[PDB]
Amino acid sequence: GPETLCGAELVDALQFVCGDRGFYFNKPGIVDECCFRSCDLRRLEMYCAPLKPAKSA
């Protein structure tokens, strides 16, 4: 998604992904991994709980 964004906007970047290629809302634990802070791109693809995306390369 971005590269730094825990000030709410994280959710829009997160929501580009989240559908098995990530979560779907009802699942929690996700926004959590971002707002451990220095929120992420491609660790974006490890915070919306995503597997394959572009995290892996």
Curated annotation (Swiss-Prot):
Its main location: secreted. One of its GO terms (molecular function) is transmembrane receptor protein tyrosine kinase activator activity. Residues 29-49 are annotated as: A. Residues 1-28 are annotated as: B. Keywords: Deafness, Disulfide bond, Dwarfism, Growth factor, Intellectual disability, Secreted, Signal. GO terms for biological process: activation of protein kinase B activity; androgen receptor signaling pathway; blood vessel remodeling; bone mineralization involved in bone maturation; branching morphogenesis of an epithelial tube; cell activation; cell population proliferation; cell surface receptor signaling pathway via STAT. Belongs to the insulin family. The insulin-like growth factors, isolated from plasma, are structurally and functionally related to insulin but have a much higher growth-promoting activity. May be a physiological regulator of [1-14C]-2-deoxy-D-glucose (2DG) transport and glycogen synthesis in osteoblasts. Stimulates glucose transport in bone-derived osteoblastic (PyMS) cells and is effective at much lower concentrations than insulin, not only regarding glycogen and DNA synthesis but also with regard to enhancing glucose uptake. May play a role in synapse maturation. It is linked to Insulin-like growth factor I deficiency: An autosomal recessive disorder characterized by growth retardation, sensorineural deafness and intellectual disability. This is Insulin-like growth factor 1. The gene is IGF1. The chain holds residues 49 to 118 of 195 of the full protein.
